[PDB]
Design a protein around this nucleic acid. Structure first.
Ligand SMILES: [Mn+2]
Length: 101
DNA sequence: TAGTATTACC
């Protein structure tokens, strides 16, 4: 049930929610990336994220760390694929660690 | 899994 690797989307993040995530300790993660997306024409600003935790984490622990309003899923793709997907719009909020095999 | 949404990796 608890799982090491999760993606997340957070739609219309507020400055508070961005700070919560910004302020996460980097010791929590083997790899973590968060991109700001959805800022272009007629479209929803959101965080596009991926977390590879040091330890496996339950669904509700992940929501505690990242925020109540996040949509989260067990990651099916590799760290590298997620790194590319969450970097695709060119405005990264944070990235720490390195992608893992 | 719940929450926010059409954004969400393979
Ligand atoms: Mn996106």
């Amino acid at each position: 049930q608890p799982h090491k690797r999760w993606v997340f989307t957070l739609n219309n993040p507020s400055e508070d929610e961005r700070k919560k995530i910004r302020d996460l300790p980097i010791s929590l993660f083997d790899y973590f990336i968060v991109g700001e997306e959805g800022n272009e024409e007629g479209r929803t600003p959101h965080l596009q994220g991926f977390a590879n935790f040091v330890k496996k984490q339950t669904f509700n622990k992940v929501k505690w760390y990242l925020g109540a309003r996040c949509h989260i899923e067990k990651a099916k793709g590799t760290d590298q694929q997620n790194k590319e997907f969450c970097s695709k719009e060119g405005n990264l909020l944070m990235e720490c660690g390195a992608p893992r095999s």
